[PDB]
């Protein structure tokens, strides 16, 4: 939980908030589970994305 | 498919009123290259506006154009509100003034143009309505400004 610092802008706090969300990866997870992907497809995506990484 | 911007042509100041804008107004009024009739209409209109207004013709004309010219307009891309360029602002102002004057009911163009310029100074002309309508539709599409 980002807490606004003393003498810190809400906009500055918002920057900190956005970064923490990115590291958490909650957005990433949400998009993946929007629609069902068959087991074989899931495994392929995991592999090739890792190949990219 | 275009190379780039093309340099714009320039106009000499109006002899009678020493305004570049006055020269551009003549150009919009002119039809079929008939400059003299266009100049005649404008100068006569400026006499009538001053006569009725009791104020300098250029002053009221400047006041009129200021009301007609629009800060924002919608462009199809969803319609997006966009800032009108300074040069575009003048084009739209002059075009709207002349076009809406032509749609007025007075018998002669000079009277129509004077009634329009007077009305626009009072912020009540059809050209003013055009700006107001343009601004309204731009505000309605404010969400798409991004």
């Amino acid at each position: 939980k980002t807490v606004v610092r003393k003498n810190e802008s809400l906009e500055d706090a918002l920057r900190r908030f956005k970064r923490s969300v990115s590291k958490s990866g909650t957005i990433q997870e949400v998009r993946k589970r929007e629609f069902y992907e068959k087991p074989s497809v899931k495994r392929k995506k995991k592999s090739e994305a890792a190949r990219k990484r | 498919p275009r190379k780039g911007s093309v340099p714009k042509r320039d106009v000499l100041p109006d002899p009678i009123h020493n305004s570049k804008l006055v020269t551009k107004l003549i150009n919009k009024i002119m039809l079929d290259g008939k400059r003299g009739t266009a100049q005649r209409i404008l100068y006569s209109a400026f006499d009538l506006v001053e006569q009725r207004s009791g104020r300098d013709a250029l002053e009221v004309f400047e006041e009129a154009i200021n009301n007609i010219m629009p800060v924002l307009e919608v462009k199809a891309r969803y319609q997006v509100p966009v800032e009108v360029r300074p040069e575009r602002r003048t084009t739209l102002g002059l075009r709207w003034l002349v076009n809406y004057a032509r749609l007025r009911g007075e018998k002669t163009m000079e009277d129509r143009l004077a009634n329009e310029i007077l009305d626009a100074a009072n912020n009540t002309g059809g050209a003013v309505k055009k700006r107001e309508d343009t601004h309204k539709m731009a505000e309605a599409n404010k969400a798409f400004a991004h």
């Binding site: 939980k1 980002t2 807490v3 606004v4 809400l10 906009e11 706090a13 918002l14 908030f17 956005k18 923490s20 969300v21 958490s24 909650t26 957005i27 997870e29 949400v30 998009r31 589970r33 929007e34 629609f35 069902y36 992907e37 | 969803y78 404010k142 969400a143 798409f144 400004a145 991004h146």
Partner: protein, 118 residues
Amino acid sequence: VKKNIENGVAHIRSTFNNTIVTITDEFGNALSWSSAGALGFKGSKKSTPFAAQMASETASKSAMEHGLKTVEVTVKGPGPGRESAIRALQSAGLEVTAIRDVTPVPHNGCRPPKRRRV
């Protein structure tokens, strides 16, 4: 008729379809709410950041009338209007003490719907 809650929580649910902002006390009792749909935004306009801001501002203003001054922000969903809503709370005059993400995530739970083939 007039409550006096100084400290409250603002919940922003931002989706690709809509933005809803509910302001509650710390115990989860609602004070005010607004949405893009409530303000009369329709279709694409509902999900725009502008609509989210307007929803946030409306909800904040009503909540302040109950004496809310400070707010803790909880954000749920992936929609484009989350940041605008947070800024609107500050703009409305409420102070954001903390911002937290509460979007729900299963630990491999229920089957998601079919992918849209079109």
